[PDB]
Write an enzyme that holds these catalytic residues in place. Structure first.
Site, short mmCIF file in Angstrom:
data_model
loop_
_atom_site.label_atom_id
_atom_site.label_comp_id
_atom_site.label_asym_id
_atom_site.label_seq_id
_atom_site.Cartn_x
_atom_site.Cartn_y
_atom_site.Cartn_z
CG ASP A 160 18.12 26.42 11.63
OD1 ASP A 160 17.68 26.79 10.54
OD2 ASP A 160 17.75 26.88 12.70
CB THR A 161 19.31 24.49 5.81
OG1 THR A 161 17.87 24.54 5.77
CG2 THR A 161 19.74 23.01 5.87
N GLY A 162 18.65 27.34 7.50
CA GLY A 162 18.49 28.76 7.29
C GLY A 162 19.26 29.65 8.25
C1 LIG Z 1 10.59 30.17 12.48
C2 LIG Z 1 11.67 30.93 12.30
C3 LIG Z 1 12.54 31.38 13.45
N1 LIG Z 1 13.95 31.08 13.21
C4 LIG Z 1 14.84 32.03 13.42
O1 LIG Z 1 14.49 32.92 14.17
N2 LIG Z 1 16.07 32.04 12.87
C5 LIG Z 1 17.21 32.77 13.46
C6 LIG Z 1 18.46 31.92 13.65
C7 LIG Z 1 19.70 32.38 13.45
C8 LIG Z 1 16.39 31.42 11.56
C9 LIG Z 1 15.68 32.22 10.43
C10 LIG Z 1 16.30 33.57 10.08
C11 LIG Z 1 17.53 33.58 9.37
C12 LIG Z 1 18.12 34.79 8.97
C13 LIG Z 1 17.47 35.99 9.31
C14 LIG Z 1 16.25 36.00 10.03
C15 LIG Z 1 15.65 34.78 10.43
C16 LIG Z 1 16.32 29.91 11.49
O2 LIG Z 1 16.91 29.58 10.27
C17 LIG Z 1 14.91 29.44 11.56
O3 LIG Z 1 14.79 28.07 11.45
C18 LIG Z 1 14.30 29.69 12.90
C19 LIG Z 1 15.02 29.03 14.09
C20 LIG Z 1 14.12 28.94 15.30
C21 LIG Z 1 13.28 27.82 15.46
C22 LIG Z 1 12.44 27.76 16.61
C23 LIG Z 1 12.44 28.80 17.58
C24 LIG Z 1 13.29 29.91 17.40
C25 LIG Z 1 14.12 29.98 16.26
#
Ligand SMILES: C=CCN1C(=O)N(CC=C)[C@H](Cc2ccccc2)[C@H](O)[C@@H](O)[C@H]1Cc1ccccc1
Lengths: 99, 99
Positions: B25-27
């Site tokens: 997960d890059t984000g």
């Molecule tokens: C669709 C977005 C939801 N999401 C998150 O909630 N988070 C959170 C992970 C730490 C961050 C995005 C984010 C980063 C910084 C601030 C706010 C949101 C991840 O980078 C995302 O890929 C993703 C991961 C995820 C995938 C599937 C189910 C639940 C979670």
């Protein structure tokens, strides 16, 4: 470009005439951008994250220029803290992950 | 390898002698993992996400093997839907985003 991940991978996008920063997110299936004004009609849908489910609007057929490469796809706008470019667009821009 | 983003970038980790599947997960800035048994020397912390905040146990110096590269870092265990490898580790397996 190659992006390393010592910093958050942010890119400018131009969407709906507006210019924003957005995080390139291989973890997200969908693109969700904070509320802003977009033209067209739209549907209510909701999505999950860690933390929980936010309600959002599905916009389809919408045109983004992402780091200038262009693309059309569904954007969800709704209550995110960060605008996220998820695999539905990352795929049209041709992104890859390399390790 | 090179992961194309048509499908989720899932990988196997070996963590605490248990085998998991996780998302590159890059984000995400941190690595957060579903609840699991770790050698419990840890602290409360709260990470934010989409749709809310969740409360996690922070462990550091956890050895993780994410494909046959071992990487050692901080791991947040807690109520996430999906195991997430964030940038703190990806930088340690050398991963790049490219387009
Ligand atoms: C669709 C977005 C939801 N999401 C998150 O909630 N988070 C959170 C992970 C730490 C961050 C995005 C984010 C980063 C910084 C601030 C706010 C949101 C991840 O980078 C995302 O890929 C993703 C991961 C995820 C995938 C599937 C189910 C639940 C979670």
């Amino acid at each position: 470009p190659q992006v390393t991940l010592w910093q958050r991978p942010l890119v400018t996008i131009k969407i709906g005439g507006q210019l924003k920063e957005a995080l390139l997110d291989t973890g997200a299936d969908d693109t969700v951008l904070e509320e802003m004004s977009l033209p067209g009609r739209w549907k209510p849908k909701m999505i999950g994250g860690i933390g929980g489910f936010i309600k959002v609007r599905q916009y389809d057929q919408i045109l983004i220029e992402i780091c200038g490469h262009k693309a059309i796809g569904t954007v969800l706008v709704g209550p995110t803290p960060v605008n996220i470019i998820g695999r539905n667009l990352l795929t049209q821009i041709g992104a890859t992950l390399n390790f």
